[PDB]
Amino acid sequence: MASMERFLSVYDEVQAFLLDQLQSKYEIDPNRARYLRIMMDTTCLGGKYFRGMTVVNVAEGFLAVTQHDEATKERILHDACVGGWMIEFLQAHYLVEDDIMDGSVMRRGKPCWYRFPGVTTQCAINDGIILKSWTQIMAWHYFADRPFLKDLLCLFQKVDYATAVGQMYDVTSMCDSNKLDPEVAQPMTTDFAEFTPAIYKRIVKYKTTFYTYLLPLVMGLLVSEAAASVEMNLVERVAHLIGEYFQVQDDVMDCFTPPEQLGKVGTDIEDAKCSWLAVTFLGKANAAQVAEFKANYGEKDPAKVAVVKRLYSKANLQADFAAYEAEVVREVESLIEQLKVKSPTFAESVAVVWEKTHKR
Amino acid sequence: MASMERFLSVYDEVQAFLLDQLQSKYEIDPNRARYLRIMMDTTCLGGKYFRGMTVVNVAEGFLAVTQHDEATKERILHDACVGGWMIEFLQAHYLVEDDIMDGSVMRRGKPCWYRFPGVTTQCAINDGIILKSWTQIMAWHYFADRPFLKDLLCLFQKVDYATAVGQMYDVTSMCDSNKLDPEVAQPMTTDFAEFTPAIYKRIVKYKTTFYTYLLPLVMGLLVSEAAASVEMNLVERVAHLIGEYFQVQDDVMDCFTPPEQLGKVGTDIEDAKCSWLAVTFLGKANAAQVAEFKANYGEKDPAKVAVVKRLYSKANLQADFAAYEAEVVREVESLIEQLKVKSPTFAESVAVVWEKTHKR
Ligand SMILES: c1ccc2c(CN3CCCCCC3)c[nH]c2c1
Ligand SMILES: c1ccc2c(CN3CCCCCC3)c[nH]c2c1
Ligand SMILES: c1ccc2c(CN3CCCCCC3)c[nH]c2c1
Ligand SMILES: c1ccc2c(CN3CCCCCC3)c[nH]c2c1
Ligand SMILES: [Zn+2]
Ligand SMILES: [Zn+2]
Ligand SMILES: [Zn+2]
Ligand SMILES: [Zn+2]
């Protein structure tokens, strides 16, 4: 059976289990069950399922070289699917809450969940909470007796926490760190001293890389009982690297991809994001370019957003991106090489993750 | 050492551990550490600590009748304190998110967290997320090797989920169930057919009783390794009953306690809450009283909120409250009696929980 139809079949199974359990144990009525079904479909479906399918792909690699009964192969593939949906629901939680936090309008060519007429922020914040709670309901039901439950829950917990810390890094990236104070309304940075590669790297590592690359790879190893087939430090280092590349590509597309293909109107410039474009521009700008950037960045005024996009264009950031990309290819190829020492199979799953990221 | 100074000492220990771990493992800077310290103090401290201290009290009861080394007594008391702070942080999460959801202005005589000038909703939603993530960081660090970790995490998970489901029950309690539809803006009920005791009971059981009474009692039993000293069905039934009484008292105070003593201006009437007052009023109103209620309920207009408060006053709901209270006393005394069959110690902790609720 093809990996994707297995994954989607498990979505239907996990949805039915969750909604049936709300009816049998949580006293839910049919109308609220329907609302939660529709919230689940709207918030969890419609992407590429890259994160969840990575768990499945890693598990498939190990199945091709490991002796098991047929029934055990089916159990491992089911477990990989459930663990993949745990990550897809964790993401769904963060996308719902982030869209509310950032006052976002669209995602994947549809209104943000909170903007649905019958939802509103009051409901959406709690729907987000429910989405993350469903990750734990899935785990405890499907993995109750599994030898990897402890390790999976502890990892999942740490990655969820890392993500929430990265969110804090991201929402505060345009503030001066010395001025952060719950008692005082936060002015935007005037110097942009904190728009550095190391500070950018810290945001992306916590907000994106742990849940998008580390967790899917390590969960594929845990459901496979294969974590001692790998050097965990190499897994962390290659996750780091690939996830950062993913986020740099995202940041470039925010500014330069047509809205019709992006699924939204990019607002990183108006939101004064610590973006790869802003850090890379400041890393090569002359004094006049820096001064014009400070005059225009972080403002809704379309004229000022256009002055920032023209500054980025004139600054030939395509060159910097090509150089960054070439350095990432060297380093990720080097880490895939080191991974082949303890597991060729796992090294090959990382190579697939990298291919799917590099030209998406 | 007095229970309360032990509990507060552990807050300082757990705060230091969390902030030190953010610095050693999550690359946090001093200014963001200070912001999170202040968010933790502002959102977790200043209440009565009833929920957390219940874990400590249940553990203290078992210590008085169970042979242990001194060091083991100290470990159980520490564990009860950490488990109590897990519930206090879980509550803090829900109070932050609920204040944002409901557009609340004050809590405990201070602005809601999201309303602090240097916070805003963008940050506060994520601060709420962090608060619940800290529950899991506490558990995994302090309880890593504990025999009760599995059972504690599974219970905690289910109670958190129940609470989020109850939130959904509460925010949708003024909608007609058949009209719930994410695609369609929700009108307020015109008939109030769903303002019934059974529907009220469902809201309160899920939103309040699991985290405020069931979880503290059962966590005190888990850290004590004493869960087979009790009939879990009796624990669920007495938690049910006491928690509902707590929420009925809350609802009455929303309408009738001066704001200076409430710590806020009650808005349940304007928010069209399915409150004990609204259900109890509709349970005894004549046709003209019901019609005037429908004309005025669920509107910001102070004149209309005053018409609802005068309707409640004229309706002598004090009588209904006295009758309800008398029925709760019978039933809770009956359940404390049944609990004494398997554990007198535990029965006595439930009696203390009830006394502290009954005349607060
Ligand atoms: C699709 C889905 C997720 C992402 C992210 C990652 N960020 C999402 C926002 C919430 C938490 C921060 C991480 C960048 N681009 C995306 C395209
Ligand atoms: C500035 C920097 C880089 C680029 C690119 C190259 N793109 C490759 C497609 C994947 C996403 C990365 C961007 C096109 N326009 C740019 C302007
Ligand atoms: C102090 C603290 C908590 C409560 C509640 C319980 N509700 C809180 C709001 C969030 C989740 C629903 C439960 C009622 N009155 C309170 C006084
Ligand atoms: C309507 C219903 C009951 C009452 C009470 C009795 N109060 C006892 C104090 C604890 C909280 C419950 C309320 C005073 N005014 C009321 C109006
Ligand atoms: Zn965001
Ligand atoms: Zn982006
Ligand atoms: Zn509320
Ligand atoms: Zn209330």
* Dihedral sign of CA atoms B339, B340, B345, B350 in order: positive
A34: contact with B, CB 8 A cutoff: yes
According to the entry, how was the structure determined?
A: X-ray
The answer on whether A236 is annotated among ligand-binding residues is yes
Instruction: With CB atoms and an 8 Å threshold, state whether B126 touches A42.
Output: no
What token pair was written down for B247?
A: 């929420």
Q: Would you call B69 exposed, middle or buried from its count of C-beta atoms within 10 A (0-12, 13-18, 19+)?
A: exposed
The enclosing domain of B360 has a CATH number of 1.10.600.10
Total domain count, chain A: 1
Q: Whole-angstrom Cα distance, residue B160 to residue B210?
A: 8
Which structure tokens are listed for A202?
């810290």
Written as six digits, the tokens of A269 are 């410039």
Distance CA B34, CA A151 (A): 31
Q: How far, in Å, CA of B282 to CA of A132, rounded?
A: 37
Q: Which amino acid appears at position B24 of this protein?
A: S
Where chain A is broken, by preceding residue (C–N > 2.5 Å)? none
The angle that helices B120-142 and B30-44 make with each other, rounded to 10 degrees, is 90
Cross-chain Cβ contact A183/B29 below 8 Å = no
Resolution attained, angstroms: 1.6
Q: How far is the CA of B171 from the centre of ligand 7 (A)?
A: 7
A100 touches chain B (CB under 8 A): yes
Q: What whole-number distance in Å separates Cα of residue B37 and Cα of residue B56?
A: 24
Q: Is A263 left (phi over 0), alpha (psi -120 to 50) or beta?
A: left
Domain boundaries, position B171: 1-360
d(CA A241, CA A212): 12
B24 touches chain A (CB under 8 A): no
For B275-280, which contacts have Cβ atoms below 8 Å and span 24 or more sequence positions?
A: B275/B200, B275/B251, B276/B200, B276/B247, B276/B248, B276/B251, B276/B252, B277/B251, B277/B252, B277/B312, B277/B317, B278/B192, B278/B195, B279/B195, B279/B196, B279/B197, B279/B199, B279/B200, B280/B317, B280/B320, B280/B321, B280/B324
Residue tagged 């082949």 (tokens): A340
CA of A312 to the centre of ligand 2 (A): 11
Residues of chain A with Cβ-Cβ distance to B36 below 8 Å are 168
B107: which strand partners? B110
User: Which residues, in sequence order, are CB contacts of A258 under 8 Å at separation 6+?
Assistant: none
Retrieve residue B279's tokens.
């259900």
**What residues have CB less than 8 Å from A190, skipping those under 6 apart?**
A294
The partner residue sitting opposite A118, judged by closest CB among B36, B182, B202, is: B182
Q: Chain A contacts of B183, Cβ < 8 Å?
A: 116-118
How far is residue A63's CA from residue A77's CA, in Å, rounded to a whole number?
A: 9
Residue of B nearest to A103 (CA): B122
User: What is the secondary structure of A215-260 as a DSSP string?
Assistant: HHHHHHHHHTT-GGGS-HHHHHHHHHHHHHHHHHHHHHHHHHS-HH
> Do the strands A110-111 and A106-107 form a parallel or antiparallel pair, or are they unpaired?
antiparallel
Cβ A182–B32 below 8 Å, yes or no? no
By alpha-carbon position, which residue is closest to atom 2 of ligand 4? B318
- For residue A290, with 0-12 CB atoms within 10 Å meaning exposed, 13-18 middle and 19 or more buried, which class applies? middle
CB B137 within 8 A of CB B14: no
A271 contacts: CB under 8 Å, gap ≥ 6 = A102, A174, A298
**How far is Cα A318 from Cα A323, in angstroms, rounded to an integer?**
9
